[PDB]
Amino acid sequence: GIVEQCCTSICSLYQLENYCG
Amino acid sequence: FVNQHLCGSHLVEALYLVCGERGFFYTPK
C-alpha cells in the first residue's frame, strides 16, 4: 500500500494521485 | 517534493498538497 510505495520506497506523483478522491 | 521517501506526516502533507479539493484517503496499514 501507500507506505510500501512512498515511505519505504521512493514516492511518485503518479502514486499519490491514486489516493485522491 | 513528491519524488522522495515520504513517511508519516510528510506523506500526509504531500497527499494534501497534491490532491487539493479532491481530498484523499490515507491508509497506512
Curated annotation (Swiss-Prot), chain B:
Domain of life: Eukaryota
Effect in UniProt of substituting F24S: In HPRI; Los-Angeles
Gene (name only): INS
UniProt source species: Homo sapiens
Protein's name according to its UniProt entry: Insulin B chain
